[PDB]
Amino acid sequence: MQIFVKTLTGKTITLEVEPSDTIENVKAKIQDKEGIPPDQQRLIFAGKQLEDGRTLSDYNIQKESTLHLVLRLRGG
């Protein structure tokens, strides 16, 4: 299926995934498509944090859902 990832700037990318795909793997498709290192990526769904070690199916992500990409903060 295809899903959408909306960036912080509001730019929307189309991704090609499967409900078996992991969050890790989803980040790899993003990296491949927008050059963003996976260790910077954090995936949000309608406000809900998608845990790094999990799968789309765990969070019932449907065809054409929109995911939000936020950044891992690096505070000292």
Binding site: K6, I44, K48, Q49, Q62, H68, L73, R74, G75, G76
Partner: protein, 316 residues
């Protein structure tokens, strides 16, 4: 004239100590491998004279001590002890001053984030399931936070000196907190696709990423619908002691009597620095060991905490 007895105890979990006696000259790890003393990897060293009436740390062995370990830490990770100890060596050196009625942490090894965490927990009606974290926590509220801080790093897979996200760190911690009676109920209203209701429990009941305003989540935030229109999400029922609203750092106004506490993130796409804001008889800005009071504040807020008991909505 002498003896090969130094008399020290070995354990995994502070509480129950075991006893294994070795020679005065027999080193620790040549026989029991990974062994620690207050963090000091004493794997390769000779027993001494001061080593008496004390306690030691080791990896579990007889698959019973792995149960004795789990029933204190709530983890099956064997690397946990090492990452906890390698980090306790540094944390024990930090200073924990009482700023504004709360236990803070002096700037060191990029611990500003750990400081927000600790500062906010002491304001929230919350308890830990893991015994390690609840005992370390009790001492932490009293000024003894070296172990709490080391724990946090260990549960978060973060090393000392490493930069950190307060929201992510709070998340690792709430995994081990009691939030089983935490309940959030959301409606999403699409003009075409209809109204969906969903229920959330546990950590996910109290976290949100997209707005700092608890009031916005009650009057409706805008999310994409699967059909291509925008829909409206809104809180219908919340049952928890607190909520944590979070959003990418952005300028926000903080005025007393509308929130509990919060934290700001000044920086950019790479580095950054957290300071903590709490509300008392006025606003307290707490950066590490430094306090400042102000009537009002505006700046790069990223998380806000709000007190909650029970809430139901006035919509549909």
């Amino acid at each position: 004239m002498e003896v090969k007895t130094i008399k020290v105890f070995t354990t995994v979990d502070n509480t129950n100590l075991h006893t294994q006696l070795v020679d005065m000259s027999m080193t620790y790890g040549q026989q029991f491998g990974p062994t620690y003393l207050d963090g000091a990897d004493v794997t390769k060293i000779k027993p001494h004279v001061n080593h008496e009436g004390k306690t030691f740390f080791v990896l579990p062995s007889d698959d019973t001590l792995r149960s004795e370990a789990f029933e204190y830490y709530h983890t099956l990770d064997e690397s946990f002890l090492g990452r906890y100890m390698s980090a306790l060596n540094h944390t024990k050196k930090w200073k924990f001053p009482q700023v504004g009625g709360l236990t803070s942490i002096k700037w060191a090894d990029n611990n500003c984030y750990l400081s927000s965490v600790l500062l906010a927990l002491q304001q929230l009606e919350v308890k830990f399931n893991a015994p390690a974290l609840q005992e370390a926590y009790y001492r932490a509220r009293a000024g003894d936070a070296a172990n709490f801080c080391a724990l946090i790093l260990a549960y978060s897979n973060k090393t000392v000196g490493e930069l950190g996200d307060v929201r992510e760190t709070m998340t690792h911690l709430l995994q081990h907190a009691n939030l089983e009676s935490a309940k959030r109920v959301l409606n999403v209203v699409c003009k075409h696709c209809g109204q969906k209701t969903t229920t959330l429990t546990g950590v996910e009941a109290v976290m949100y990423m997209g707005t700092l305003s608890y009031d916005n989540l009650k009057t409706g935030v805008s999310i994409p619908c699967v059909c291509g229109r925008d829909a409206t999400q809104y809180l219908v029922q919340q049952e928890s002691s607190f909520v944590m609203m979070s959003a990418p750092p952005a300028e926000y106004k903080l005025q007393q009597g509308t929130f509990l506490c919060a934290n700001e993130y000044t920086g950019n796409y790479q580095c950054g620095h957290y300071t903590h804001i709490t509300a008392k008889e006025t606003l307290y800005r707490i950066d590490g060991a430094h306090l400042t009071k102000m009537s009002e504040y505006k700046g790069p807020v990223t998380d806000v905490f709000y007190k909650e008991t029970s809430y139901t909505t006035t919509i549909k």
